[PDB]
């Protein structure tokens, strides 16, 4: 919740999948404000330099929820940052 | 304030959303205008939702969007621009009126609408 290390990889993947499907069932402005919250939360806990770019402008091969998670995992490992909860 | 959309837009195809980060924005594609022209909208929020949903039915736009941005526009949500075109916490592509209502542009005039990145929008404002 507060940090990335509070997430297991599966739990974090659950959030990322919401950027591809309507998990919440919300529509219109309410859906947008939820996705707004998820985006800024994503940027906050991952501390990734490309921010939401990881999700909305992914590198080739990393366009899927699995790829997004893997990009986060790889970047944080490369920067000596704590990874996901085990596991 | 409810209204009726008018305008023909402008006929260009390809990565039309690439022009959103340049100049004074990219005008609304004609094939997008076709889906909006002659329709009634209860509010601007209503029009904004319908606009992106129309973008979601356009192959020329879809092909140049990530799978994530494709889902968003399919839900009537504004797509996100590249990080390079962000402005702090402002990240979404934005619909903007070229001339404001008091100068005196029309609210639902498609020919008065352009798409801009948050970064380009600030640069436009500075040039005024």
Numbering used by the authors:
A (entry chain D): 4 to 90
B (entry chain C): 643 to 770
List sentences from the manuscript.
Immunity proteins protect the colicin producing, or “colicinogenic”, bacteria by binding and inactivating colicin nucleases with very high affinity (Kd ≈ 10− 14 M) and specificity; the discrimination in binding affinity between cognate and non-cognate nucleases by Im proteins can be up to 10 orders of magnitude. In the context of DNase bacteriocins, the HNH motif, which coordinates a single divalent metal ion within its centre, binds to the minor groove of genomic DNA causing random cleavages that overwhelm the DNA repair machinery of the cell and result in death within minutes of intoxication. The immunity protein associated with DNase colicins has an unusual mode of action; rather than binding directly to the DNase catalytic core, these proteins associate with the nuclease domain at an exosite adjacent to the enzyme active site. In this work, we have solved the first structures of the DNase domains of pyocins S2 and AP41 in complex with their cognate Im proteins, in addition to the structure of the isolated pyocin AP41 DNase domain.
Pyocin DNase–Im complexes were crystallised and structures solved to 2.0 Å and 1.8 Å for the pyocin AP41 DNase–ImAP41 and pyocin S2 DNase–ImS2 complexes, respectively. However, surprisingly, the relative domain positions in the AP41 DNase–Im complex superimpose well with the colicin E9 DNase–Im9 complex and do not exhibit the twisted relative domain positioning that is observed in the ColE7–Im7 complex. Compared with the colicin immunity proteins, ImAP41 loop 1 contains three additional amino acids and this is reflected in the more elaborate conformation it adopts (right). The first aromatic residue, Phe59, forms a parallel π-stacking interaction with Tyr722 within pyocin AP41 DNase domain in a manner similar to the Tyr in Im2 and ImS2. The PyoAP41–ImAP41 complex is stabilised by an orthogonal (T-shaped) π-stacking interaction between ImAP41 Phe59 and PyoAP41 Phe714. The second aromatic residue, His60, forms a hydrogen bond to the backbone carbonyl of Tyr722 making contacts equivalent to those of Im2 Tyr55 in the ColE2–Im2 complex and ImS2 Tyr56 in the PyoS2–ImS2 complex. In the alternate hotspot, represented by PyoAP41–ImAP41, the invariant Asp is replaced by a Gly that has very different physicochemical properties. A complementary substitution in the DNase, PyoAP41 Pro725, accommodates the vacated space in ImAP41 (right). However, the second water that is coordinated by the Asp side chain in Im2 and ImS2 is absent in the AP41 complex; the absence of the acidic side chain from ImAP41 removes this water-mediated interaction. The cognate AP41 complex is strengthened by two water-mediated intermolecular hydrogen bonds between the guanidinium group of ImAP41 Arg53 and the carboxylic acid of Glu726, the side chain of which occupies the position of the water in Im2 and ImS2.
